[PDB]
Amino acid sequence: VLSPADKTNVKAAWGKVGAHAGEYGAEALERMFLSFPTTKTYFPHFDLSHGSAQVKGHGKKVADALTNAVAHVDDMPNALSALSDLHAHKLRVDPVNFKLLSHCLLVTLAAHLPAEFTPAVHASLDKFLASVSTVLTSKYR
Amino acid sequence: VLSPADKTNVKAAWGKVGAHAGEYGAEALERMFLSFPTTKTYFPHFDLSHGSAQVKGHGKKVADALTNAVAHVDDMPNALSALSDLHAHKLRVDPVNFKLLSHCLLVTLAAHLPAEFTPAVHASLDKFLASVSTVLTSKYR
Amino acid sequence: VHLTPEEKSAVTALWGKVNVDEVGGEALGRLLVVYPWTQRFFESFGDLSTPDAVMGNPKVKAHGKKVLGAFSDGLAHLDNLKGTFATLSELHCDKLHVDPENFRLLGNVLVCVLAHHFGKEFTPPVQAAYQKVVAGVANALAHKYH
Amino acid sequence: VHLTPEEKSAVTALWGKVNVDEVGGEALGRLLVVYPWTQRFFESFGDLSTPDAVMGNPKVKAHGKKVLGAFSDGLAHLDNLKGTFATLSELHCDKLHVDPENFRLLGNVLVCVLAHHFGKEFTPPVQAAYQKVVAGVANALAHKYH
Ligand code: HEM
Numbered sequence: 040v041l042s043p044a045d046k047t048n049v050k051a052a053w054g055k056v057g058a059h060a061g062e063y064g065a066e067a068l069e070r071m072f073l074s075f076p077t078t079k080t081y082f083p084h085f086d087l088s089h090g091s092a093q094v095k096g097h098g099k100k101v102a103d104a105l106t107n108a109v110a111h112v113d114d115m116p117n118a119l120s121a122l123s124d125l126h127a128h129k130l131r132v133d134p135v136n137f138k139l140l141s142h143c144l145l146v147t148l149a150a151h152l153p154a155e156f157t158p159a160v161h162a163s164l165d166k167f168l169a170s171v172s173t174v175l176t177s178k179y180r
Numbered sequence: 181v182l183s184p185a186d187k188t189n190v191k192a193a194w195g196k197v198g199a200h201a202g203e204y205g206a207e208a209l210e211r212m213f214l215s216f217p218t219t220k221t222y223f224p225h226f227d228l229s230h231g232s233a234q235v236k237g238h239g240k241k242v243a244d245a246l247t248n249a250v251a252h253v254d255d256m257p258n259a260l261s262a263l264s265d266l267h268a269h270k271l272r273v274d275p276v277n278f279k280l281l282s283h284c285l286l287v288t289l290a291a292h293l294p295a296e297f298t299p300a301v302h303a304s305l306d307k308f309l310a311s312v313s314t315v316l317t318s319k320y321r
Numbered sequence: 322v323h324l325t326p327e328e329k330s331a332v333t334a335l336w337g338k339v340n341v342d343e344v345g346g347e348a349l350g351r352l353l354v355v356y357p358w359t360q361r362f363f364e365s366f367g368d369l370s371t372p373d374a375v376m377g378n379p380k381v382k383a384h385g386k387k388v389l390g391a392f393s394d395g396l397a398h399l400d401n402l403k404g405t406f407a408t409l410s411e412l413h414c415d416k417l418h419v420d421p422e423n424f425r426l427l428g429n430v431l432v433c434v435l436a437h438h439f440g441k442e443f444t445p446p447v448q449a450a451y452q453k454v455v456a457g458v459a460n461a462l463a464h465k466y467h
Numbered sequence: 468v469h470l471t472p473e474e475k476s477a478v479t480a481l482w483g484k485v486n487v488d489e490v491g492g493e494a495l496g497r498l499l500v501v502y503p504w505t506q507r508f509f510e511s512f513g514d515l516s517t518p519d520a521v522m523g524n525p526k527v528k529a530h531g532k533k534v535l536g537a538f539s540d541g542l543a544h545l546d547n548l549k550g551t552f553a554t555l556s557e558l559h560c561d562k563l564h565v566d567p568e569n570f571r572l573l574g575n576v577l578v579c580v581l582a583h584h585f586g587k588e589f590t591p592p593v594q595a596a597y598q599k600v601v602a603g604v605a606n607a608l609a610h611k612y613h
Pocket residue numbers: 078081082100101104105122125126130132136137140141171172175
């Protein structure tokens with residue numbers, strides 16, 4: 040459960056990404072593919088090399104989903120319901136993998152926003168991404 | 181998320197425990213302590229040997245909490261809120277351990293209720309215990 | 322992994338009563354039903370649309386028999402699970418990219434199947450011995466990730 | 468664990484710039500704040516009541532320096548992490564009963580601290596090399612459970 044301070048912390052930190060949202064989503068995906076090669080097998084139709092236009096475009100989509108969750112943090116199951124259906128039903132993403140992308144999103148934010156990435160904000164962002172992950176793994180059937 | 185069939189399945193299976201509720205909760209705890217010895221360190225004030233009156237009494241409490249969750253399956257965060265505060269805030273139970281007790285509860289039900297423990301009911305009971313576990317690990321702060 | 326002689330006795334006495342043509346399919350079928358992302362790896366198996374379709378799918382039963390044969394081999398070589406599972410590790414890690422958490426999950430589904438089939442005979446100490454076995458098999462199977 | 472020479476170069480070049488008196492306390496303090504059940508193991512450390520109390524707790528800083536020294540040792544012995552971590556495994560598994568998932572969590576908190584401190588220099592390939600390192604340390608530390 041996200042406290043009022045966690046919600047403020049996540050909004051404020053994410054607020055500093057500005058026009059870089061898509062870029063940071065793309066970077067987190069690249070970090071995941073390189074660090075955790077098992078995740079690559081979900082994207083056989085993409086080239087995952089550096090500078091990939093497909094990873095760049097997907098990173099904008101991932102960032103847009105995370106901004107949706109920030110903007111609707113009190114109603115996240117509803118906001119991410121379609122995405123939760125997609126990842127579980129159609130894509131069959133293994134729940135372990137959400138922990139891996141979540142870690143790589145934290146690393147990307149830490150690498151770009153050092154003033155924002157205080158221990159308290161780190162904790163809030165981890166709880167936020169764990170809540171997103173709980174929603175995105177809630178529909179297996 | 182629990183479907184209507186999952187809710188029916190869990191109620192029906194748990195319904196067959198009857199006067200054995202406390203006993204099965206106690207057995208699951210014993211199974212956990214023996215199979216996963218790291219869990220013993222949370223109970224230094226109990227003797228964990230077979231036939232322990234302390235494990236017998238605690239098993240009745242665990243079973244009562246699970247019946248609460250069955251009876252209020254559509255409002256589980258609220259029903260288990262006090263217990264969620266206890267396990268995270270006071271007891272600092274490592275979230276991994278909920279997976280271990282959940283497995284041992286499944287094993288205990290399978291060992292006693294073979295006609296109830298069909299593949300579909302197994303799946304429902306696993307989802308139910310994972311949802312209980314999500315609530316009981318929702319309050320770390 | 323560490324089994325005492327009394328645990329080994331408990332484990333092998335029960336295992337001698339296991340139907341080796343059926344229990345591996347029951348465990349694999351329950352893995353696919355209980356943890357349905359695992360179906361991603363079995364597209365060629367055909368009908369997995371319902372629990373009944375999965376459990377009565379002849380390819381699930383046949384593949385499950387192979388899985389259980391690997392467990393039987395581990396039981397016969399508890400002091401060299403790594404060697405025993407080397408080629409299966411290369412397959413599941415390097416070639417199939419299965420997350421190794423799923424090896425733990427299948428071991429635990431097999432424990433549930435043994436509980437179901439043996440009832441009161443699957444005592445807490447007998448379970449504890451089988452948890453050491455399935456942990457050691459999962460760890461050996463995950464060796465190529467380590 | 469498998470690091471290529473180019474990964475080893477990337478890892479050790481960065482590590483030479485790490486402040487070894489500070490980074491281990493930053494990682495341990497962040498573990499206690501981000502994963503607060505881990506505080507169960509540090510009751511004698513005194514004030515852990517707020518993030519500021521944790522991060523400025525001199526016992527967290529001092530203990531973190533020991534933790535980082537063990538990572539430094541692993542970096543110096545990447546081809547025998549098991550030997551390197553044997554006594555620490557006995558301590559953390561047999562004596563303290565720490566669940567080994569927490570070893571993974573602390574490794575990943577250290578990765579986040581390195582990202583924070585090195586910024587753009589902590590490139591995706593440099594991270595991938597450090598993930599191999601912290602995975603190998605966690606696995607070696609968990610050896611007494613295997
Ligand atoms: C923070 C967690 C995650 C978020 C917010 C997220 C977000 C999204 C978004 C927004 C889409 C596009 C949906 C379409 O076009 O409606 C998508 C697609 C998809 N995601 Fe994720 N995702 C997450 C984690 C994961 C993980 C962990 C994996 C696998 C390792 C994964 C694999 C995929 C795949 C394979 C697609 C479809 C790609 C297309 O087939 O081209 N996602 N995700």
